[PDB]
């Protein structure tokens, strides 16, 4: 509707930081060499570096003469300035120490949350801005070995249940180097060796190398103790950036990037907009340099009309058409609300009976149990426009008894629904495992935890779940069944909107390189497909093959893309190779492809909690919605380098207000997922989710996927 001024985490840099003369050169590493000489790598392949100092290098090299700051592509200008700021004592090391002067490390259990700042340079107009973004690392104060209780048959479990985000820091080394545990590719089995000789070499390697003094050794042993030969050696690779190193759980500690991911920790890593603003001002005021401004830059944003808030509507059996944003004699009943869909998959026309399962976590008080079972019973009735299983969902014996009991009632059946009520104790893996195991049996499931059950009750009926919550549960289940329970008063100027994502995983006669999720111009999800490919030749996926298989797979599912216009989006920056693949697919099928980067991981932050969007550095930042309940700062979705590809040809475009509106609507298609955090247009979001489901051994019912069933969500 209207404009506004908000503060962002940028601080203008002084032009005077720009170097007098710049030296180019053609050819520790190439990046080190540059950094060592106060310069940067202009060209990775042809090893060309730009230096602000006479290049010192005792090897070969060819001087390519001086160049001026105005001749570098923007990116390089920004990288070069970032590097120069460091020379002035303004780098991630320095300012992170300042941050910790105001936001100190806090420990929770055996874990320590460490605040620090992530810094980059964005060139906006003709100026350069230093982006300072507060982030947190979560390091264990206990060693991996100590964590698993020196039990090997417990260590492997750990590497497995935490495979996705687990990293290991070698606290036994002066450089505190971080590593990534290696796994039996396409498996969750970690690469291990109980070979006592390996464990001895490397354990002895640390000492002879970094602690070769009587006292350095004494501390070492006081600190870590004698080698525990019963421990297996963990094969892993550098986290920076092929090599492969050995780590001893006795000398490493798990480490994680908080943003990349308990409870008391989150209330500490989540910061309100004013807390972030304050902390950067504390840092800035402590910065004794005039090479950068003393205060945060403000920018003019475009607020988003509350009208676009109501383009998604639901309806009942009568003629009530209210948008997604939520006395009468009947309000006394526990009956759920009535949602009359606009479209129901044709698969439901034949299906006979549909088994219903109330799966109750035996560890929930009786009342909570009855509450849940009574709530599910009402949820199912509305579902229609029964077996009760009770087990300790928090033990490998129960989940198995549950699955075992379900498969018993599911043989001969095409579809089943499971309503699970579990404590909050359950790990994500356990929830994921119950849902995946149960889907192997054609059972779609909806989990509801104790939290919602206790704190989301209705003020007029404490024996009934919150009416807001009730509608969202209904939406989630319905969406897992491909039901078009809503209508969108909007039309996309595209034939189809497609979200893809690459995540190579070998599977039973498969080899799947990624996934694609298709939405039609009405904003409905119509097809979800896996992208099967050949065994990777070179160290890089053949996108041409990838995207062709995309076109072919959709045909298999009843959708020809040839001679069609589509908005293809992916989870992240669009790589050159993916572009080629898109040019490839463009010509071969005469497909008009409109694409752009859709970044969710950038450091730019606007210290205001409201729906808005603005232009910064040639990109567009958008906040799809405001945080309504939970504490924290909104994370904008970054859009950039848009382009249209017709007849194998790429033509750079500019992101228009209409473009931003399309992303906005696509982002609000979160399908009643309580706790809105969808920071990606539904197409890319679900694309990402499916790639995961495949990598997690989820059954691929092509029958459901062809109708848009979000069963893996
Ligand atoms: Mn992804």
UniProtKB/Swiss-Prot annotation:
Biotech relevance: Can be used to create artificial restriction enzymes using denatured tDNA with appropriate guide DNAs. Multiple gDNAs can be used in a single reaction. This is particularly useful when cloning a region without any known restriction enzyme sites.
Residues binding Mn(2+) 1: 501, 571, 688
Region (Interdomain connector): 260-333
Organism: Pyrococcus furiosus (strain ATCC 43587 / DSM 3638 / JCM 8422 / Vc1)
Documented activity regulation: Inhibited at greater than 500 mM NaCl.
Active site: 501, 539, 571, 688
Residues annotated as binding Mn(2+) 2: 501
Chain ranges of the Piwi domain: 416-699
Any one GO molecular function term: DNA binding
Disruption phenotype: 2-fold increased plasmid transformation efficiency.
Name of the molecule in the record: Protein argonaute
PROSITE patterns recorded: PAZ (PS50821), PIWI (PS50822)
Ligand binding (Mn(2+) 3): 713
Catalytic temperature dependence: Optimum temperature is 87-99.9 degrees Celsius, has very low activity at 37 degrees Celsius after 16 hours.
Residue ranges, annotated region (Mid domain): 334-487
Summary of subunit composition and partner proteins: Monomer.
BP GO terms, sorted: clearance of foreign intracellular DNA
Superkingdom in the source lineage: Archaea
SMART domains in the record: Piwi
Originating gene: ago
Primary role: A DNA-guided ssDNA endonuclease that may play a role in defense against invading mobile genetic elements. Uses short 5'-phospho-ssDNA sequences as guides (gDNA) to bind complementary target strands, resulting in cleavage of the target DNA (tDNA). Endonucleolytically cleaves DNA in short dsDNA (the gDNA indicates where to cleave on the tDNA). Efficient guide-dependent target DNA cleavage requires a minimal gDNA length of 15 nucleotides (nt) and works up to at least 31 nt. Overexpression decreases plasmid transformation efficiency. Has no appreciable activity with gRNA or on target RNA.
